[PDB]
Design a protein around this nucleic acid. Structure first.
Lengths: 139, 266, 89, 54, 146, 71, 97, 157, 164, 51, 90, 408, 103, 51, 49
RNA sequence: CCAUGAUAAGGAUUAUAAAUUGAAAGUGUUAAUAUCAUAAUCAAAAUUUAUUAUUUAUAUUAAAUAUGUAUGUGUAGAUAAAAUAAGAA
């Protein structure tokens, strides 16, 4: 059960059908979907000639960003500079402490797994743990 | 058991008029005798309230690039702000400054009365950005911090009425306000001419006119921001005699006299 | 007072003699009992006077048709030319 | 702090509180001009005699 | 109101036709020009000023001017009407009672009391003031005249 | 000659359209020759059937006549 | 508009919106209308000029009636000026025949 | 503020004003953003005047200017949430919880039609109404007819 | 098939005429058009759904262009797109606000003109009436919350609240 | 006539983007490539937003 | 009902109640109104007249011969809405 | 009969009929119902069909009366002209302004012929006015048919009402999507309009005044739109839109790419110089040959210069076929040589070049840039030209054009 | 105005009387731009340009803003430094350092 | 050099012709949000003419 | 003091919340917009002088 | 949190006839009880939750970014829908 302010304000109204590609809250759970032949044409800008998004650059006289935007595309300088790179994700943040050259040119949201396979055994309740065991997700 | 959102406030008029004006009762609003607006806030409180107006890309938001806190607690997990120097290493620095935000007058009409790209809508009338001082909009000092409370935001105090007033603007509202607050006639009776910045354009127009390039002369005339002098109009009118362009001469005379303070009444 | 306009009261109609006695399926208020009970072979399958639909307008907020010229029903021959075959123009 | 002359209670000392914005007939709020410096019979007191002024 | 004042609306048409014909405007006498300018200021609003004459501040300033001059008998916002006129009991069939189906703001000289059943001139002899009862009306004339 | 009005489709090779053509031809023949009306009326050629396809309704699963799943 | 959006702050911008919506200025001119004698003694437009004009204006002409819908400016006064200018330009380019 | 002497019954009604302001910002920025986007990613030469380096350098500079434009209204219209102006209830366009003509939610529409607050006419629930275009082709046909009435009717100059 | 389109000059022709490409260039001079060089010659498709009278949705105009890759980012779309200025969005962003009375005119100005002073909203009146009706019976439930606590914490010299 | 009169002289555009020419001369911009060395090997791979 | 008011111009129930005109009844103007003719207010503008001279006028009018004769001297003296900046002692 | 047609012919007919919707010349000279000088369409819109029908009837009656009075005034005015009148010298000049009539020479229309043309026009206008008056008098309370033009004026036509069906949920459930969809309801907004068509054989501002002022007294909840189709005389002249030959170098597709409407094209018409400067080795015939005009017409255009002197500015005749275009395509280059006693070898400062070229220093910097980049200026208030500057180019504003460099 | 049996007796006129027509017509002024008189030719050169405050504004599609686009290009090229703008890269340039930049 | 519309059927489906994947965008109809959300600025007739 | 300035709005109460009575008069479409076309006394005196 | 009322879904007996196969008994948001309450989209986001028709084996990723998963004898239990331009006695 996701806990957020909008959860009380809005209502799911069951498994309602939305217009194609027009769900209100976008949750790209398929960003980390791997596809070798379609590596450059999945969750990425369609044209190779397009410039990098505005989110990859600093515009004004900034004082500092806690985390960079997900659409910011990983570049060589991200690994070469050896600086601190963080991306907001559940639960709190994901930090790039393993700079690799195999992710150059791909978006950080594509690199980061949205739906983490790991399940917390601590906050899980008795009934919820029983449900997970019945589903097979937990022993 | 007294609670207050703001623990200190300041008055509007200083100690030269209120001491005498206090003897005259003021008919305050019956159902709310005590009022406390944004122009009555202290400096720090007003700054921190105006920072929170913008949804994002503003000082109030914890991660917008303009924050000042050393650390931010996120989901019971502390995080440290990456400084600008460390960001610069892998984020290329592109920055023009206040000049990028502002747009030219000729593009103001296409941008629908807005010469500023700032995310707070700037209105040139002296009533929307109404702090204690009248609302005056700067052009080369536009910044995200915006020390002068001249912009319009939809989260600060006593903003609903200003939002309604902005939405009820008439046609040519901002354009008319800009014109009437920038091209006002001088008190001494002299026309608002002899502007130092606009002077070369007049000479260029005069040269093109005397060279008989009336089309290019008008194409450069439309770029004039202030009111051109009578020399421009007399040259443009005298250009139409060889070509018998009475239509264009009449149009020039109308644009000169009917609108711009009867400059072409010569 | 702007509400002084919404002040005029009305009066109920004046009845005579006793009250209409009912008959000594849920009793539906909308349906008129005796009129509906009356045979269709006599009363005809009509819910309105037989007048051209041009004179009838579908009302608002009421599930019935009303007439713009109230009670003044022009016959069919009024619209048609004099002595018209099948009321054709 | 709160006071009997600052709270909104409808009745004070058994009489209708005159300190409530909602405790006055709306015609009182209508704008009017001071007339104490005018003539004695031109003041608002002689409303029924105003039509007979010379 | 007098209906012949509409004839001044033709003046801008005549001025435009004079512009087309080449008749000078200034050659008119100044006495005539004063009234011509009056009719122009009454029936010659430009488009630029038409884009703004419909607002709130201007209408409420006109309301304030009317209040200051003491003439509010012909303003939609500031005039509330209390008098009502009841139905007529037709003698054809007095059993049926009549109910109102609409409401109109008739100027009250359409349906006046005929003179012969009226007190003499009803103006100087009697002074009538339409005030409001302070007691609970419970239904009736809230605004009654004395 | 037959002129199609209303909703036009590429191929109208269906029994409903054939019935419409039959009714149109019968009415034209009746208008042309008066005494032809009796056989056609007694055989039902001129009679019109008021049946029509149920209109769309998004509440239905398909939109016409099938409700949604119930538990 | 008189039903609503009048007499108050609505009217100021509603009138402008209506005028911008109705900025269109149609200009119609028959092809046979132009087929007269010019002041120089030659016919203004001949069959060849008409054919060239028809080729130049694919859909702007129809049933021998050239039509141009000037929609460039909000003001009809400026839109008619633009329409006349474009019509004269098209006619001049068609007169090459 | 902080629910001290609130005048409006619902706090969320101010989000309607915020949405109107964001629409006005879109009105301001819709031309500049579109022009910058068009210039930035046009590979073909613009004209004889600008070709090669004179064009690519200009594209880079205009893209830099667009990025430096602080507060530009990037967000599209379909991703902006629609909130009723009467009861501050959110509805998403394209579903049945929002009506396009009245710009109010399904609940507000039902309340207003059930009371007397909006002059509407009743039609059959499982039909195509009374409009000829809706009977003919439906939603897409009436949409195309609106397009034809607006733009395709005019022989543009 | 694949071919190179030739262009025979009228001067080189046995008898000169006006070439169709020359006339089209004149047309582009007249009306400022765009000649898409990369437009293929094999993709000229007619929208038969809306261009053929066979279908019930026939309208006579090419309502849509048959191009699956036609999106919105491309400058071809951008150039011929319609700006939202003065449109139904312009109408909605101004007419649709919570208070239609405030849309028509300022509430404070309207009250100061027709009435005496500014009148509070019905909700505020409800709050004031409930407070009036509940303070008479008891004075324990209420508390003191104000925007500016400075005046309450430092009352003027001659402020003595009446004991109750 | 040599050229069409309605055409615009290139000096107008030069005066328009005068700063661009000066900056190009200062920074010695010989050429700005837009494709890699062997982009022509794979035609469907790149597909610039004009084709 | 409720805190939110009901606008009578948009609400058809108020417009079709017994206190207004029903749609079945004929739609026609009733009691034509003349407000701008019975008592017309003078034009008082909140903003000052923008085209006002805003100065003292001297009504300079001399014989044309003398004016053209003194034209070389009068160029330094102020003209209509034109003020040369010549030194006053000159 | 029976009809059998080709599919392509059917398709072409249908699409042509659909497209040719507004291609109708409403105002013609044909005699009868069709044929008028101005046309007015009052599209009156309301909520109810009977509302708009009754409003259309009322407005039709009002317009019938007003138009009858206007047309009768026009008739009693035109019968005076038909009885007798005079032709103005302006009209005579208009009729005799042609250089060559259809008969190959100058035509001399006299008073009698001009009056005959005027009288024919007045007769046609009178017959149209009489037709309008008769159609206005035709309607009667016994039988009033306003939906046909023959028996009514102005005749009233119909228009398809705007009907919009809004489909929305009615349930307030926040869980059951099936229930929400099954609770769907349809309610539609309707706007009914009626169109009133008036065809006046003349343009009168009085009728427009009486027509635009009916929105004040329109019925309840009804608006109106005024479509106006009026004949207007437009002037086409070769002075500003000439018919010249195609350029020697034809424009290609490269000049019509994207953004070419602004990058390399200016708004028509392109300016052509109407003034010229005469050289020393010239005469009246020489300048006439240079400008491609008659010497007599050039002399008449000048109208004040009996003699031609070297370095004199004259006015180019408006009908000249070789009029120069402003800002000729040949760039102007300022030579480095002083051609004076200032330095004797090269221009030193930029102010000197600005004075020579009569242009601003900022424009001089912008035109080339190279001099600004390589400017060998000392920071101690000393600016000098770079020794590597091969040439100095003049700004576009100072360019000049000549026939030799502008014509092939 | 002499109709005593008005409203009360069910009399509502079908046609608005001439007196009321004249009253309503005389109450409001006439727009001076509705005369649309024209005597001189169109101004090809100066009418479109005019003055910025009352400039003839193109509306709608971007292609109609030819002058506005020209001014925007001039402003952006005169404000944005190339040294700052050169730092913008392209996707192919960035991906050229990938171990598999092209397949 | 350019091609002509293919005479044969096989090349039409064997050529590199993609298919629609995302939402369909029209140069003008994008103002009207969807066929269901038909945004009409004014309640004018669908058969209305502008002369 | 003026006898025409009366109470347009009712005394505050719960009827304004619990009843559907509108709080303002619906707009009168036939009554025209108020515009300024008058002459002041000093202006008339100056004209006569 | 609580802080009165109000619209939904739910077919079993008034039928042919010049006719409609969707109900009033109530569904989150709406008008009197108070007494720390700043929880609200303007993008790029976090399945554990009853109430939801998905494309099945010739040709398969181009424009806002848009689904990598489960081939297994049309296969247990349990369960859904339709007698209206369709074809059922």
């Amino acid at each position: 059960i996701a806990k957020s302010a909008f959860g009380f304000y809005l209502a799911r109204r069951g498994q309602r059908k939305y217009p194609f590609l027009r769900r209100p809250h976008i949750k790209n759970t398929h960003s980390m979907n791997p596809s070798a032949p379609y590596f450059w044409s999945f969750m990425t800008a369609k044209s190779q000639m397009a410039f990098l998004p505005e989110e990859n650059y600093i515009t004004g006289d900034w004082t500092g960003k806690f985390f960079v935007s997900k659409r910011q595309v990983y570049t060589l300088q991200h690994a070469t500079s050896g600086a601190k790179v963080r991306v907001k994700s559940f639960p709190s943040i994901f930090e790039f402490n393993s700079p690799s050259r195999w992710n150059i040119g791909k978006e950080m949201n594509t690199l980061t797994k949205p739906r983490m396979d790991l399940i917390d055994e601590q906050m899980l309740t008795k009934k919820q743990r029983l449900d997970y065991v019945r589903a097979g997700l937990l022993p | 058991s007294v609670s207050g959102v703001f623990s200190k406030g300041r008055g509007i008029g200083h100690e030269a008029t209120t001491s005498i004006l206090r003897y005259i009762p003021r008919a305050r609003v019956p159902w709310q005798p005590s009022r406390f607006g944004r122009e009555n806030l202290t400096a720090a409180d007003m700054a921190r309230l105006w920072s929170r107006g913008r949804y994002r890309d503003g000082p109030g938001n914890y991660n917008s690039g303009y924050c000042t806190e050393r650390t931010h607690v996120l989901e019971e997990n502390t995080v440290s702000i990456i400084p600008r120097r460390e960001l610069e290493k892998y984020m290329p620095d592109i920055t023009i400054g206040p000049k990028a935000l502002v747009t030219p007058v000729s593009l103001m009409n296409a941008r629908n009365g807005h010469r500023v790209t700032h995310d707070l809508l700037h209105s040139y009338d002296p009533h929307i950005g109404r702090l204690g001082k009248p609302a005056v909009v700067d052009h080369d000092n536009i910044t995200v911090e915006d020390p002068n409370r001249v912009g319009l935001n939809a989260a600060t105090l006593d903003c609903r009425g200003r939002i309604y007033r902005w939405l009820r603007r008439g046609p040519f509202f901002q354009v008319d306000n800009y014109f009437r607050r920038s091209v006002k006639l001088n008190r001494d009776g002299t026309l608002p001419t002899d502007f130092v910045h606009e002077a070369p354009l007049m000479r260029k127009i005069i040269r093109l006119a005397h060279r008989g390039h009336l089309k290019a002369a008008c194409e450069e005339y439309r770029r004039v921001t202030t009111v051109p002098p009578v020399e421009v109009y007399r040259a443009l009118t005298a250009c139409c005699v060889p070509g018998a362009k009475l239509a264009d001469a009449v149009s020039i005379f109308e644009d000169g006299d009917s609108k711009l303070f009867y400059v072409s009444r010569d | 007072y702007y509400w002084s306009r919404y002040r005029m009261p009305t009066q109920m109609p004046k009845f005579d003699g006793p009250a209409p006695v009912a008959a000594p399926t849920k009793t539906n208020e909308f349906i008129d009992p005796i009129d509906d009970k009356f045979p269709m072979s006599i009363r005809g399958p009509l819910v309105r006077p037989d007048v051209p639909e041009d004179q009838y307008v579908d009302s608002w907020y009421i599930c019935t048709s009303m007439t713009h010229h109230m009670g003044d029903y022009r016959p069919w021959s009024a619209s048609a030319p004099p002595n018209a075959f099948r009321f054709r123009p | 702090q709160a006071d009997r002359r600052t709270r909104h209670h409808m009745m004070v000392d058994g009489q209708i509180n005159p300190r409530e914005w909602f405790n006055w007939h709306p015609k009182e709020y209508q704008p009017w001009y001071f007339d104490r410096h005018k003539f004695l019979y031109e003041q608002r007191q002689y409303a029924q005699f105003h039509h007979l002024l010379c | 109101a007098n209906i012949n004042v509409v004839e001044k609306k033709k003046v801008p048409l005549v001025l435009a036709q004079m512009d087309e014909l080449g008749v000078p405007r200034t050659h008119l006498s100044r006495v005539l020009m004063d009234e011509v300018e009056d009719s122009l200021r009454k029936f010659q609003t430009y488009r630029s000023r038409f884009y703004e004459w419909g607002r709130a501040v201007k209408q409420f300033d006109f309301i304030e001017f009317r209040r200051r001059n003491g003439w509010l008998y012909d303003l939609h916002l500031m005039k509330c009407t209390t008098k009502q006129v009841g139905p007529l009991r037709d003698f054809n069939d007095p059993d049926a009672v009549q109910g109102a189906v609409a409401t109109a703001e008739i100027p009250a000289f359409f349906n006046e009391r005929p003179a012969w059943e009226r007190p003499p001139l009803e103006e100087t002899l009697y002074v009538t003031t339409n005030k409001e009862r302070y007691d609970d009306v419970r239904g009736g004339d809230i605004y009654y005249d004395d | 000659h037959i002129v199609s009005e209303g909703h036009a489709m590429p191929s109208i090779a269906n029994e409903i359209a054939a019935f419409a053509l039959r009714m149109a031809v019968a009415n034209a023949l009746v208008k042309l020759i008066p005494l032809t009306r009796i056989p056609l009326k007694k055989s039902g050629l001129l009679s019109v059937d008021r049946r029509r396809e149920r209109g769309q309704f998004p509440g239905y699963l398909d939109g016409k006549k099938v409700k949604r799943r119930f538990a | 508009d008189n039903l609503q959006y009048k007499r108050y702050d609505w009217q100021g911008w509603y009138q402008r919106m209506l005028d911008v919506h109705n900025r269109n200025v149609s200009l119609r001119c028959r092809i046979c209308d132009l087929q007269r004698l010019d002041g120089n003694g030659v016919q203004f437009v001949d069959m060849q000029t008409e054919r060239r004009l028809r080729i130049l204006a694919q859909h702007r002409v129809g049933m021998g009636v050239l039509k141009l819908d000037a929609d460039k400016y909000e003001d009809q006064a400026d839109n008619v000026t633009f329409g006349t200018t474009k019509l004269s330009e098209l006619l001049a380019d068609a007169r090459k025949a | 503020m902080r629910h001290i002497g609130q005048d409006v019954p619902k706090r969320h009604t101010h989000f309607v004003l915020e949405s109107r302001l964001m629409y006005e910002k879109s009105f301001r920025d819709c031309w500049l953003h579109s022009v910058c986007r068009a210039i930035s990613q046009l590979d073909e030469p613009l004209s004889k005047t600008v070709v090669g380096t004179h064009q690519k350098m200009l594209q880079r500079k205009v893209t830099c200017f667009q990025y430096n434009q602080y507060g530009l209204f990037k967000t599209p219209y379909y991703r902006l949430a629609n909130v009723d102006r009467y009861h501050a209830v959110q509805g998403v366009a394209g579903t049945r919880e929002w009506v396009p003509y009245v710009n109010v939610s399904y609940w507000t529409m039902n309340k207003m039609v059930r009371g007397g607050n909006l002059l509407v006419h009743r039609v059959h629930y499982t039909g195509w109404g009374t409009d000829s275009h809706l009977k003919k082709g439906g939603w897409e046909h009436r949409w195309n007819k609106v397009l034809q009435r607006n733009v395709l009717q005019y022989s543009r100059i | 098939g694949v071919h190179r389109v030739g262009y025979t000059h009228p001067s080189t022709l046995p008898v000169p005429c006006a070439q169709r490409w020359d006339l089209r260039l004149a047309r582009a001079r007249i009306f400022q058009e765009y000649i898409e060089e990369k437009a293929p010659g094999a993709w000229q498709l007619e929208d038969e759904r809306s261009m053929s009278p066979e279908f019930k949705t026939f309208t006579g105009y090419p309502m849509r262009d048959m191009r699956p890759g036609y999106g919105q980012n491309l400058p071809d779309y951008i150039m011929k797109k319609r700006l939202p200025n003065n449109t139904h969005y312009e109408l909605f962003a101004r007419r649709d606000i919570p208070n239609e009375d405030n849309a028509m005119y300022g509430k404070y100005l309207y009250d100061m003109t027709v009435h005496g002073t500014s009148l509070p909203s019905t909700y505020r009146m409800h709050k004031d009436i409930n407070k009036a009706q509940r303070n008479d019976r008891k004075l324990s439930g209420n508390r003191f919350k104000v925007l500016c606590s400075s005046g309450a914490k430092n009352p003027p010299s001659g402020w003595e609240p009446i004991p109750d | 006539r040599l050229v069409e009169p309605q055409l615009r002289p290139q000096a107008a555009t030069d005066a328009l983007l005068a700063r661009t020419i000066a900056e190009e001369e200062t920074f010695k911009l010989k050429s700005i490539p837009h494709l890699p060395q062997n982009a022509e090997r794979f035609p469907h791979e790149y597909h610039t937003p004009t084709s | 009902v409720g805190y939110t008011p009901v606008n009578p111009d948009t609400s058809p129930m108020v417009a079709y109640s017994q206190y207004h005109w029903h749609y079945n009844l004929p739609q026609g103007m009733e009691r034509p109104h003349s407000v701008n003719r019975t008592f017309a207010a003078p034009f008082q503008s909140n903003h000052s007249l923008v085209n006002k001279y805003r100065g003292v006028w001297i009504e300079f009018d001399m014989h044309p011969a003398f004016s053209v004769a003194l034209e070389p001297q009068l160029r330094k003296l102020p003209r209509g809405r034109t003020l040369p900046k010549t030194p006053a002692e000159e | 009969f029976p009809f059998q047609w080709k599919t392509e012919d059917w398709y072409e007919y249908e699409v042509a009929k659909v497209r040719n919707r507004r291609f109708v010349f409403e105002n013609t000279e044909e005699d009868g119902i069709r044929g008028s000088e101005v046309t007015y369409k009052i599209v009156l819109e309301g909520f109810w069909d009977h509302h708009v029908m009754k409003l259309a009837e009322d407005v039709c009656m009002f317009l019938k009366d007003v138009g009858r009075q206007i047309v009768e005034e026009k008739l009693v005015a035109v019968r005076r002209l038909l009885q007798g009148g005079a032709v103005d010298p302006e009209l005579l000049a208009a009729f005799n302004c042609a250089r060559a009539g259809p008969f190959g020479g100058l035509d001399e229309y006299d008073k009698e012929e001009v009056a005959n043309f005027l009288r024919s026009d007045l007769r046609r206008l009178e017959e149209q006015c009489l037709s309008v008056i008769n159609r206005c008098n035709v309607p009667v309370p016994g039988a009033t048919n306003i939906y046909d033009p023959h028996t009514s004026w102005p005749h009233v036509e119909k228009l398809e009402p705007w009907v919009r069906m809004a489909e929305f949920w009615t349930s307030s459930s926040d869980t059951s999507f099936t229930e929400l969809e099954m609770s769907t309801a349809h309610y539609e907004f309707r706007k009914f309009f009626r169109v009133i068509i008036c065809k006046l054989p003349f343009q009168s501002t009085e009728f427009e005044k009486r027509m635009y002022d009916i929105r004040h007294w329109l019925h309840r909840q009804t608006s109106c739109e005024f479509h106006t189709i009026y004949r207007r005389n437009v002037i086409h002249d070769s002075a500003v839109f000439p018919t010249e030959h195609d350029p020697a170098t034809p424009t290609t597709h490269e000049h019509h790419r994207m953004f070419s409407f602004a990058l390399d094209w200016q708004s028509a018409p392109v300016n052509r110089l109407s003034t010229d400067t005469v050289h020393e080795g010239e005469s009246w015939d020489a300048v006439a040959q240079r400008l491609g005009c008659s010497v007599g017409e050039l002399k008449d255009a000048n109208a004040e210069r009996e003699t031609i002197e070297a370095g004199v500015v004259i006015n180019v005749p408006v009908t000249a076929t070789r009029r120069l275009t402003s800002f000729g395509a040949t760039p102007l280059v300022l030579p480095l040589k002083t051609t004076s006693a200032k330095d004797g070898e090269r221009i030193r400062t930029w102010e000197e070049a600005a004075a020579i070229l009569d242009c601003t220093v900022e424009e001089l910097q912008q035109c080339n840039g190279h001099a600004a980049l390589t400017y060998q200026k000392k920071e101690s208030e000393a600016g000098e030209f770079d020794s590597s500057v091969t040439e100095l180019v003049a700004p576009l504003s100072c360019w000049t054009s000549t026939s030799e460099s502008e014509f092939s | 105005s002499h109709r005593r049996d008005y409203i009360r007796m069910g009399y509502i006129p079908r046609y608005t009387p001439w007196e009321w027509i004249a009253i309503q017509e005389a109450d409001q002024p006439l727009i001076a731009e509705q005369i649309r008189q024209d005597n001189i030719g169109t101004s090809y050169f100066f009418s479109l340009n005019r003055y910025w405050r009352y400039k003839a504004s193109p509306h709608g599609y971007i292609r109609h803003f030819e002058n506005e686009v020209r001014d925007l290009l001039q402003y952006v090229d005169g404000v944005t430094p190339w040294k700052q703008a050169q730092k913008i890269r392209t996707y192919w340039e960035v991906r050229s350092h990938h171990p598999m930049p092209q397949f | 050099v350019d091609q002509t519309p293919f005479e044969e059927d096989q090349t039409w489906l064997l050529h590199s012709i993609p298919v629609q994947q995302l939402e369909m965008h029209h140069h003008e109809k994008d103002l009207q949000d969807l066929p269901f959300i038909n945004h009409e600025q004014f309640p004018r007739s669908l058969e209305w003419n502008a002369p | 003091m003026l006898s025409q300035n009366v109470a347009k709005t009712t005394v505050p109460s719960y009827y304004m919340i619990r009843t559907n009575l509108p709080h303002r008069k619906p707009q009168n479409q036939w009554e025209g917009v108020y515009y300024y076309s008058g002459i002041t006394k000093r202006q008339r005196h100056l004209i006569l002088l």
